[PDB]
Amino acid sequence: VIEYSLKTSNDDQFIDITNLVKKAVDESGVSDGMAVVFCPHTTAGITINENADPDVTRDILVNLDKVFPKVGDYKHVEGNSHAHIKASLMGSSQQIIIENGKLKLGTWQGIYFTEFDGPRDRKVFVKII
Amino acid sequence: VIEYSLKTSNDDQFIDITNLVKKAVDESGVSDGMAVVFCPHTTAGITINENADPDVTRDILVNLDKVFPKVGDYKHVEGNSHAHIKASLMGSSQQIIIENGKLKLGTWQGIYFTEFDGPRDRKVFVKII
Amino acid sequence: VIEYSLKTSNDDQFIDITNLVKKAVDESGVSDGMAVVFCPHTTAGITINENADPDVTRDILVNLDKVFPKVGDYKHVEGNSHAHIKASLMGSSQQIIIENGKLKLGTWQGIYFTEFDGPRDRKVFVKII
Ligand code: NA
């Protein structure tokens, strides 16, 4: 697979895609398996983290920016190497256990698309196995 | 799936859970497949790294702390954003190949639960496919 | 699974192994599934990132080095804790969707072995499921 389109709206942004993943699980009919969530963009990634406090996602974005700023020792002419770095640090995919037809997530644990070079028209892939 | 309970004992800690994963493999009877190890906590994660030198795990913890300290530019009122960041950096899960009924790990390569907000009663999930 | 041998040539290096993964897919005959790429070395890892601009891979290596330098607050007697840290940050494995017998990768998105303690004789494992 299911491809979802996402429109990102800031240069960096966490977008909670947990329900997009649940919908793919529900469509699949799979009761027990794995959900794989993959980002095909080299300046974005996927992570799993706190999903009910905006201050946590702000703290992550702000502090990743502090450590790998937009301006620095970067040769890359497009000027988005900071985004490439942060993308690799978050990861290109994550996976979640499906048990009893539900994503086996912890308390206030959600699945995020992590944009580091928005605003852009983005895709995310969800495969249920 | 197998849920294991872990009691962590320091604010940050690497706990070698390789044998908990081997036990799940052995229980499953699977000779060839994958072991998926998932952390349902947003202030802890899973990584794979050196498992026979305490100085390496100390170096990792200490240097992750140096870069993302407990005190800093953090809005989050609980005061554990450092842990949320480090958790995303390690990852919410890892996976290991099962070959000939054994985890296909390299020399002195082990699977760790990475606590960043202990001491706490924690869980880790192991799914064998 | 397929084990590939790689000879790395610098202390840090990104090696594009995308075609090694495609060959494993092609050998498997699998049309739809997953490719899992695993690094058995604790001082190297796997990441997915830009594969057509050398400046991006240079920016990543250089800036990871800047943040976690070779010399610092490290007890580990071999002197490669920087590599252990960076390895955990990239990850021990990545996975890619196989669709229509092809790796489902984005534009200029490639799979890299990330060496942090070369030059060495290394292995990478590719499992197709
Ligand atoms: Na990471």
> What are the extents of the domains in chain A?
1-129
Tokens representing residue B120 in the block: 């706490």
- Nearest Cα of chain A lies from the Cα of B100 at a distance, in angstroms, of 22
Do the bridges between strand A93-99 and strand A102-103 make them parallel or antiparallel, or are there none, so unpaired? antiparallel
- State whether residue A51 is helix, strand or coil: coil
* Closest CB from B66, B97, B108 relative to C127: B97
Minimum Cα–Cα distance from A100: chain B residue: B1
- State whether residue A13 is helix, strand or coil: strand
- State whether residue A56 is helix, strand or coil: helix
Nearest Cα to B27, choosing from B54, B61, B51, B3?
A: B3
B28 touches chain A (CB under 8 A): no
Q: What are phi and psi of A106, to 5 degrees?
A: -80, -175
B95 touches chain C (CB under 8 A): yes
Give the whole-angstrom CA distance, residue A104 versus residue B113: 18
Give me the helix-helix angle, B54-67 and B81-90, nearest 10°.
130
Q: Residue A77: list chain C partners with CB under 8 A.
A: 55
Question: How many other C-beta atoms can be found within 10 angstroms of the C-beta atom of residue A28?
Answer: 17
* Closest CB from B55, B66, B108 relative to C75: B55
CB within 8 Å of chain A, chain C residues 105-124? 105-109
Question: How many other C-beta atoms can be found within 10 angstroms of the C-beta atom of residue A16?
Answer: 14
CB C31 within 8 A of CB C100: yes
Resolution to 1 decimal, in Å? 1.3
Contact A40 C89 (CB under 8 A): no
A73 touches chain B (CB under 8 A): no
A28 touches chain B (CB under 8 A): no
Minimum Cα–Cα distance from B92: chain A residue: A48
Distance C86 CA to ligand 1 centre (A): 9
Give the whole-angstrom CA distance, residue C80 versus residue A105: 35
3-state helix, strand, coil in chain B (%, to 5): 25, 35, 35
Q: Residue B127: list chain A partners with CB under 8 A.
A: 34, 97
HSE (side-chain half, CA atoms, 13 Å) at A71: 0
* Closest CB from A92, A95, A127 relative to C48: A92
CB A103 within 8 A of CB A96: yes
CA end-to-end span of chain B, whole Å? Answer: 10
* All partners of chain A with 3 or more CB pairs under 8 angstroms: B, C
HSE (side-chain half, CA atoms, 13 Å) at B98: 23
Distance C46 CA to ligand 1 centre (A): 10
**CA quadruple C49, C50, C51, C55: dihedral sign:** negative
Does the structural domain C1-129 have CATH classification 2.60.120.460? yes
Q: Residue A41: list chain C partners with CB under 8 A.
A: 106, 109
B6 to A46, A48, A50, B44, B118: CA distances (angstroms):
26, 20, 21, 12, 11
* All partners of chain B with 3 or more CB pairs under 8 angstroms: A, C
HSE (side-chain half, CA atoms, 13 Å) at C10: 9
